[PDB]
Design a protein around this ligand. Structure first.
Ligand code: BA
Ligand code: BA
Ligand code: BA
Lengths: 741, 405
């Protein structure tokens, strides 16, 4: 069935046939004698002995047990030696290349019933697969048996081969491609649980890579039309092409993980509340809480929070017909659980509308699904077994188990909007930028070339312009970077108000003096240049240089400038801070930059491919928390190619104008200042929830107590949902899911 | 601890296991006989002899001391020959590539106490390293033991390999990169004297190369925060990025050698005074004064000047409270030394302000440092031992040594 097999069998048959005929010839001549001596030297030599001797001399061994005594026998022996030597000298290379032609990664995939498996394809590559493997095969998982069956074109790398071998009990590999139905039959997609599609986040043409990924999705849906597919996309505008696929059903499980949208939304939410990027980068990623005596108090307190995850559970019968604030404060005070959001639209028409910290109007219906923040699934299981009577006063929650019965908005009304204007309508020089008293704004140091791939700055400014912010509450975003790249980005950026542009490199200190950076509320540092074609450690040279330059400036607070560098290669995070004194082999988290919200790596998005498979509602919760709501109808509107459009929207669509946003509050002053005076976290949580409808996610706390002697820096780390009795320093800040400003 | 080592041990274990089991099989069949002849051809053959014969025939040697006499023994011998030949024909290429995978430049750097070493990295390349090696390892140096421990990514070139071998007593080489803390631990940067960073002076994008060099400096300062680093830069505007590094202390030794600035400044100073480029290109470079009868008068007179260098010495007690012109003309007329400049700002606030040929207003303070032009360090040592009385009229400057206070 194979041409190479035909060639190999032809060679082996020729070899054995010549061997046999030479054996017969030598046997005849040796047993006959020599006509030179009139056949007087013939010896009784059995044919099988001649076969033995012939193969012995073919292998260049020559035992000497059997040998040619006849003169002509010796001559034929020598002649066969020349013939054999020439035959091999001519035929070895093709034998070697036939042996090398054997593909080491072919063959189908065989699994036993009850063992789910997930097909992964697209951009299988060591860096792109390492993070997804860390999250998917992370050690303290509720490890239901699941095998990652890869399907890539080329050979794996040496380090990728090591990854394959070290996880060989779970991870496999198969040469092939998505666009071959035989290949999809090999990996048994017909009985697969899901089929993830990774992407090359650093490709030179994001549109072409997105189109290729969508083509792979088309192939998968053509082969099997009811398989859940998780897709990694590079651009937000390419997220509507998946809606064209007739087998792409969002309600059935298929989701798109947009790299640009999610990354820039994480950064924008960090802009609204500093350090909120690493709060959700740890909320939706498997992390291990393994405290050690080496780690200090702050580091252990942060590592306790990073090990806490988000889970989905059905509210027990007790929560039925109860308002959301009461249910959440009961889950915290009584059940010691943090209830973020609830699916609520199951009332009238359709499910899957995640009300996040809804107002007291929303009531808990029967068997509604709620999202909790908890250490593991066993802790969130308590929310399903709580009852009115049998757990009314049961302390030690371990025992609560198994009861015995003039502003223009976008048409969607989600984002602020302005009529399309040319680039020069907001383009400014250093004189104009300095003239404008920018305060509490957001500076975006964008390292891009004239032809560098588009990254979609829209996804950075879109969450900054949510309709739940008052117009005076809008942070004036200003972008310092290349001017041609901003010409390309302005087609999408023109519809957001209070935007501004300052051309020129952001490393230029004169620009940062012009756009007041000592006064900016956040200084994003994004690099749109084409990298990862150079040394991996030199990939983020420009971002690290910009961060150090901004931290080294002086004004009339160089290190007090809040900036969030985004890292293409996570290993560079060590260079973001010098006083960290952390080991180079430490993972991305647990490092002072990432743990403080100053750094952010794209690799986190790779881990989002794992959770979005394990938790179906993870991605839709992330997007609601991040992108200002990003209603599906909005990307239907953007799918029409007309761009973001809308005018003075009616109050009917403005009803969703006051939704739940994430912000920060300070315990230094305000109605909640008393809890900073040695109070406990649970008291603050219950009081805020009962009095303002404010859901305290977690804490943003100084790395060391800000006494100018312990640590004279303004460095803060994030603690995700600290325990009930956590002490509250007066300088601590609180992440809140505030509603109605 | 290594996947390649695991593969190699698996192959060798498989080979030895098949060898042993084939030896046992052949021993059994040879000592049992042949059922075709009702086991009448069995021979007393010890198992170790069978092991010997089997390895002899595996190596394609075939001494003939031991051999298969049984017919079925001979058949098994031939069958094992086919199996062995196919096994090698299938398994040689991976053995060869495993043997070739052995990096020839790994391993850490080990040095004995008291032996300073200098780490060099960046753009290690024959042309870029040859001149630095000529100056650093130049023959008539005050050769305090110092080893140049290179740290580059790729393999050295053939000529670079020759440079490594000919200076192997001092020069070493190590595969790796600056941006790996394990690599910096290998070359013992924690106890290194300095860490030079060469650059590619002819790269197509000087800004990117300068940024890469500054990134390497950032890595070095992150690993060890108090190590002197000498950096080769291509642009003058990239010389300010090194000030952003919190561990970059100019007063502590870290310097930036800007290629463009220094080269074009040499040329500009030649513009002001012709031939001044080669005056300082020889003032600040180790050159040997080895006159030969072949060279003419002008050539020998120039080779005498090229061997003269610049040194730093503390002015002796005699020069204290004395004006610069008098001190310099005394160092020339009396001590036969050329005093160029003096560090003078040590008076009020901070050192390191080199007054070059200052006016008579500047006076020599106590224990000030002065820069001399002299053949070698022993000649400039006279500036430290000159005294008012004991060397007032002492001619033959060889005798101006170690005054008795
Ligand atoms: Ba956990
Ligand atoms: Ba560090
Ligand atoms: Ba000399």
């Amino acid at each position: 069935k194979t041409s190479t097999l035909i060639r190999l069998v032809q060679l082996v048959v020729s070899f054995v046939s010549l061997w046999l005929t030479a054996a017969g010839f030598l046997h005849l001549l040796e047993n006959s004698g020599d006509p030179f001596f009139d056949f007087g030297n013939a010896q009784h030599l059995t044919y099988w002995e001649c076969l033995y001797f012939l193969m012995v001399t073919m292998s260049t061994v020559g035992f000497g047990d059997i040998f040619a005594t006849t003169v002509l026998g010796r001559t034929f022996v020598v002649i066969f030696i020349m013939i054999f030597i020439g035959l091999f000298a001519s035929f070895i290379p093709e034998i070697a290349e036939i042996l090398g032609k054997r593909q080491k990664y072919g063959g189908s995939y065989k699994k036993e019933r009850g063992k789910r498996h997930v097909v992964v394809c697209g951009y299988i590559t060591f860096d792109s697969v390492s993070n997804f493997l860390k999250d998917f095969l992370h050690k303290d998982r509720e490890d239901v048996d699941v095998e990652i069956v890869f399907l890539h074109k080329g050979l794996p790398g040496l380090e990728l081969e090591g990854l394959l071998k070290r996880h060989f009990t779970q991870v496999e590999y198969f040469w092939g491609s998505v666009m071959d139905a035989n290949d999809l039959e090999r990996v048994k997609i017909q009985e697969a649980d899901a089929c993830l599609v990774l992407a090359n986040k650093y490709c030179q043409d994001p549109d072409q890579e997105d189109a290729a990924n969508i083509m792979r999705v088309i192939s998968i849906k053509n082969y099997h039309s009811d398989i859940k597919v998780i897709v990694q996309l590079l651009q937000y505008h390419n997220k509507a092409y998946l809606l064209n696929i007739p087998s792409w059903d969002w309600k059935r499980g298929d989701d798109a993980v947009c790299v640009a949208e999610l990354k820039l939304g994480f950064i924008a939410q960090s802009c609204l509340a500093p350090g909120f990027s690493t709060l959700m980068a740890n909320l939706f990623t498997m992390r291990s809480y393994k405290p050690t005596p080496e780690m200090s108090q702050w580091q252990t307190d942060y590592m306790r929070g990073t090990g806490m995850e988000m889970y989905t559970e059905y509210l027990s019968s007790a929560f039925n017909a109860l308002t959301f604030p009461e249910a959440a404060e009961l889950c915290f005070s009584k059940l010691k659980l943090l209830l973020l959001a609830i699916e609520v639209r199951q009332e009238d028409t359709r499910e899957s509308t995640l009300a996040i910290n809804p107002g007291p109007k929303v009531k808990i219906e029967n068997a509604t699904q709620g999202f909790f923040i908890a250490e593991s699934a066993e802790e969130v299981k308590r929310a399903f077994y709580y009852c009115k009577n049998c757990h009314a006063n049961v302390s030690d929650v371990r025992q609560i188990k198994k009861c015995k019965c003039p502003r223009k908005f976008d048409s969607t009304g989600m984002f602020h909007w302005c009529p399309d204007r040319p680039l020069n309508d907001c383009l400014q020089d250093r004189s104009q930028a300095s003239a404008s008293g920018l305060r509490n704004h957001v500076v975006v140091c964008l390292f891009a070339d004239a032809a560098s791939p588009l990254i979609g700055l829209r996804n950075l400014v879109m969450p900054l312009r949510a309709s739940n912010f008052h117009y005076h509450e809008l942070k004036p975003t200003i972008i310092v970077g290349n001017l041609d790249y901003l010409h390309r980005e302005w087609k999408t950026l023109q519809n957001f108000p209070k935007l501004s542009i300052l051309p020129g490199s952001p490393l230029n200190r004169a620009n940062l003096r012009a756009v007041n950076i000592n006064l900016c509320d956040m200084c994003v540092i994004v690099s749109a240049k084409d990298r990862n074609m150079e040394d991996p450690n030199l990939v983020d040279k420009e971002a690290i240089l910009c961060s150090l330059n901004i931290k080294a400036m002086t004004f009339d607070a160089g290190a007090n400038v809040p900036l969030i560098t985004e890292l293409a290669n996570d290993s560079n995070v060590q260079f973001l801070d010098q006083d960290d004194d952390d080991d180079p082999d430490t993972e991305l988290y647990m490092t002072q930059p990432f743990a403080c919200g100053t750094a952010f790596a794209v690799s986190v998005l790779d881990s989002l491919m794992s959770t979005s498979y394990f938790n179906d509602n993870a991605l839709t919760l992330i997007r609601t928390l991040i992108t200002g709501g990003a209603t599906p109808e909005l990307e239907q509107i953007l799918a029409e190619g007309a761009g973001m459009r809308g005018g003075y929207c009616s109050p009917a669509v403005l009803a969703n104008r006051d939704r739940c946003r994430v912000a920060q509050i300070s315990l230094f002053d305000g109605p909640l200042a008393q809890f900073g005076q040695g109070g406990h976290y649970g008291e603050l949580f219950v009081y805020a929830l009962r009095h303002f409808g404010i859901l305290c996610i977690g804490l943003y706390r100084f790395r060391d107590t800000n006494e100018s002697v312990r640590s004279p820096s303004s460095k803060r780390y994030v603690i995700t949902n600290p325990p009930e009795d956590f002490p509250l320093l007066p300088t601590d800040q609180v992440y809140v899911l505030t509603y109605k400003q």
